[PDB]
Scaffold this motif. Structure first.
Motif, PDB file in Angstrom:
ATOM      1  N   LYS A  34       7.043  21.183  18.066  1.00  0.00           N
ATOM      2  CA  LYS A  34       8.055  22.374  18.661  1.00  0.00           C
ATOM      3  C   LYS A  34       8.326  21.005  19.915  1.00  0.00           C
ATOM      4  O   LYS A  34       8.078  22.602  21.150  1.00  0.00           O
ATOM      5  N   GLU A  41       9.697  25.504  28.139  1.00  0.00           N
ATOM      6  CA  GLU A  41       9.767  26.444  26.179  1.00  0.00           C
ATOM      7  C   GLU A  41       7.985  25.768  25.720  1.00  0.00           C
ATOM      8  O   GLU A  41       7.822  26.110  24.613  1.00  0.00           O
ATOM      9  N   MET A  42       7.459  24.952  26.599  1.00  0.00           N
ATOM     10  CA  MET A  42       6.484  24.089  25.808  1.00  0.00           C
ATOM     11  C   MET A  42       5.368  24.660  27.089  1.00  0.00           C
ATOM     12  O   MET A  42       3.790  24.838  26.444  1.00  0.00           O
ATOM     13  N   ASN A  44       4.314  26.469  29.622  1.00  0.00           N
ATOM     14  CA  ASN A  44       3.744  28.263  29.250  1.00  0.00           C
ATOM     15  C   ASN A  44       3.361  28.380  28.011  1.00  0.00           C
ATOM     16  O   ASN A  44       2.328  29.000  27.871  1.00  0.00           O
ATOM     17  N   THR A  45       3.731  27.982  26.860  1.00  0.00           N
ATOM     18  CA  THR A  45       3.779  28.090  25.893  1.00  0.00           C
ATOM     19  C   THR A  45       2.273  27.810  25.375  1.00  0.00           C
ATOM     20  O   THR A  45       1.117  28.610  25.132  1.00  0.00           O
ATOM     21  N   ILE A  46       1.658  26.976  25.940  1.00  0.00           N
ATOM     22  CA  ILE A  46       0.954  26.237  25.541  1.00  0.00           C
ATOM     23  C   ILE A  46      -0.641  27.016  26.569  1.00  0.00           C
ATOM     24  O   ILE A  46      -1.179  26.916  26.057  1.00  0.00           O
ATOM     25  N   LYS A  47      -0.232  27.736  28.008  1.00  0.00           N
ATOM     26  CA  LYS A  47      -0.992  27.971  28.800  1.00  0.00           C
ATOM     27  C   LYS A  47      -1.272  29.276  27.841  1.00  0.00           C
ATOM     28  O   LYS A  47      -3.140  30.165  27.757  1.00  0.00           O
ATOM     29  N   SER A  48      -0.458  29.766  27.361  1.00  0.00           N
ATOM     30  CA  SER A  48      -0.240  31.292  26.567  1.00  0.00           C
ATOM     31  C   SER A  48      -1.748  30.939  25.099  1.00  0.00           C
ATOM     32  O   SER A  48      -2.166  31.646  24.839  1.00  0.00           O
ATOM     33  N   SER A  49      -1.103  30.069  24.859  1.00  0.00           N
ATOM     34  CA  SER A  49      -2.439  29.474  23.473  1.00  0.00           C
ATOM     35  C   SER A  49      -3.625  29.126  24.383  1.00  0.00           C
ATOM     36  O   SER A  49      -5.105  29.778  23.163  1.00  0.00           O
ATOM     37  N   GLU A  52      -5.207  33.032  25.081  1.00  0.00           N
ATOM     38  CA  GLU A  52      -5.395  33.574  23.333  1.00  0.00           C
ATOM     39  C   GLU A  52      -6.886  32.642  22.580  1.00  0.00           C
ATOM     40  O   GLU A  52      -7.683  33.944  22.378  1.00  0.00           O
TER      41      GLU A  52
END
Lengths: 302, 266
Positions: A34, A41-42, A44-49, A52
């Motif tokens: 992605k 876009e990267m 933060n998303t990684i951190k969220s993942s 999870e």
């Protein structure tokens, strides 16, 4: 795409893979889909993942540590102030490479850092770690004379498994009771460890019974040692003798409810203090005295 | 007694013997026939000697027999004659494996002498000095210590670096045990190596090692010659309590924690 799916994928094989190495690889794979150019876009998303993943955990500790390591690596990566492409490419590359390096590290551990069991020094080992077994097997290979001692694992019968894995080489071993641990310190030399994680304070995040063992070692002045693939420094501080982030309850006080049930919940994770590491086998060269702390300082720049 | 004191300080056993003699003297009335008197007195003395020494030794041996496992590696210090005798018995009479290790210091050649004696009887001996002990330990399985006198604390007043050895034993694997005579015990008590020191002349280390009578020209011999120098030493030191758990006498079995359990019975 999921890291969870990737994790599920490997189960029966492994033994060769090393904790975060696989997790790190999975993370890298997740990243290189992605658009890894942008940062908003990267990261933060990684951190969220990662969050999870943490939420989804049944009973696993080092994942968080691995993630942190990955983050650190990423941070290190972008400082060249040239162009976005090259750095991105490098980032993409560094996952499989990292995995490869793990194997190299393991090899180094198995050939150079194996001069602790040589003069038939009887090894007291409990807690199934892959690195330990690699060391054992490669000691057998070198013919470097040795004898093994293992305390019986009976919360879920891993002891049998361990025994079987020891039959492959073809060398006599013995069963030990963890209450009669005070009974035998006579012929067995030193106590060596296979664990789950390395503490911020200095001690070790380990299984069912360890503190008692440590105490016994101290009494006997036969130095305590830890054998690990050295990147399991979990971001956790055991501030007291009985307080930690745990997978289950801390010594679960059960009510008299049914007939022969609420007792089998054994405290299968325990800890011992920082003043026990005489040496720790690390792949960055044999360095211990206050090494983990130093590493942490280097990481958090404080 | 005074003369003896002047010469060199004595032991508790000696005192006990003296007391016994005094008691004996008190017992026999002067009105009895003289010839008849000492005829019996001497016999009685002989009997006492047989009982409170040789018989005690025998008892010690028998205690050792039941307790010691099928062939043992044995470590000792000094010139503990009873223990030497026991070792010899083990070697030749009952016939078992004797990997016996003897340690010795600079001022006294007691250990060396013991080793020599063992050799003369045909025993495999391991000779040791101060600089290291652990070199044979890190293997050592069962240890007896050097004995001289016991107190009503549970401690031992013994020779040289036995305390060090005991400490080492405590640290590494297994505790130590000492067997003694039933008339070794005192009722006097102490708890440090500052209480009562046994001294000889500072001359045992003046001669440069090797043998005792040599007479040499060199450098050593500055007790007063140069600008202030003192060369003092000690012979008897304090052995600890928590480590010698075993005490075996004429009453067979017991612990040193029971420091004066036999003093009432005698």
């Amino acid at each position: 795409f999921n890291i969870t799916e990737t994790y599920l994928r490997f189960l029966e094989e492994d033994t060769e893979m090393t904790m975060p190495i696989a997790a790190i690889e999975a993370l890298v794979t997740l990243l290189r889909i992605k658009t890894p150019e942008t940062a908003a876009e990267m990261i933060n998303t990684i951190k969220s993942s990662t969050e999870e993943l943490i939420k989804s955990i049944p009973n696993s500790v080092s994942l968080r540590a691995g993630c942190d390591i990955f983050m650190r690596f990423v941070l290190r990566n972008l400082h060249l102030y040239g162009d976005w492409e090259n750095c991105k490419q490098h980032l993409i590359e560094n996952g499989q490479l990292f995995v490869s390096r793990a194997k190299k590290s393991r090899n180094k551990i198995a050939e150079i850092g194996v001069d602790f069991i040589a003069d038939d020094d009887i090894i007291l080992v409990h807690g199934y770690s892959r690195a330990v077994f690699s060391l054992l097997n490669h000691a057998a290979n070198k013919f470097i004379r040795f004898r093994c001692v293992v305390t019986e694992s009976r919360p879920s019968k891993q002891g049998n498994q361990l025994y079987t894995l020891l039959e492959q080489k073809g060398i006599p071993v013995t069963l030990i009771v963890d209450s009669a641990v005070g009974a035998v310190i006579d012929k067995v030399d030193k106590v060596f460890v296979g664990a789950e994680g390395v503490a911020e304070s200095g001690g070790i995040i380990n299984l069912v019974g360890t503190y008692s063992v440590g105490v016994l070692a101290h009494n006997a002045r036969k130095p305590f040692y830890v054998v690990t693939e050295s990147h399991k420094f979990v971001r956790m501080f055991p501030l007291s003798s009985d307080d930690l982030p745990m997978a289950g309850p801390p010594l679960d006080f059960t009510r008299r409810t049914d007939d022969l049930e609420d007792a089998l919940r054994g405290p299968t994770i325990d800890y011992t203090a920082q003043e026990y590491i005489t040496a720790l086998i690390t792949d960055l060269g044999v360095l211990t005295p206050s090494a983990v702390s130093e590493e942490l300082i280097k990481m958090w720049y404080d | 007694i005074d003369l003896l004191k002047k010469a060199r300080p004595l032991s508790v056993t000696m005192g006990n013997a003296i007391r016994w003699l005094k008691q004996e003297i008190s017992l026999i009335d002067p009105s009895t026939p003289d010839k008849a008197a000492k005829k019996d007195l001497c016999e009685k003395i002989g009997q006492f000697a047989k009982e409170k020494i040789e018989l005690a030794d025998q008892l010690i041996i028998d205690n050792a027999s039941t307790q010691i496992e099928e062939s043992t590696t044995i470590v000792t210090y000094g010139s503990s004659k009873v223990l030497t005798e026991l070792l010899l018995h083990n070697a030749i009479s009952l016939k078992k494996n004797i990997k016996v290790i003897v340690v010795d210091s600079r001022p006294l050649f007691e250990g060396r002498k013991m080793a020599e004696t063992l050799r003369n009887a045909g025993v495999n001996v391991m000779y040791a000095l101060i600089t290291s002990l652990d070199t044979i330990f890190n293997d050592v399985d069962y240890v007896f210590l050097g004995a001289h006198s016991i107190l009503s604390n549970g401690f031992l007043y013994s020779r040289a670096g036995t305390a060090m050895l005991a400490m080492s034993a405590k640290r590494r694997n297994i505790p130590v045990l000492v067997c003694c005579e039933s008339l070794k015990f005192s009722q006097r008590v102490q708890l440090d190596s500052v209480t009562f020191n046994e001294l000889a002349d500072p001359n045992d280390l003046v001669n440069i090692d090797y043998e005792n009578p040599v007479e040499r020209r060199g450098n050593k011999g500055a007790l007063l010659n140069q600008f202030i120098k003192e060369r003092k030493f000690e012979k008897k030191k304090l052995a600890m309590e928590n480590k010698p758990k075993g005490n075996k006498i004429g009453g067979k079995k017991g612990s040193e924690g029971e420091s004066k359990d036999a003093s009432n019975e005698e």
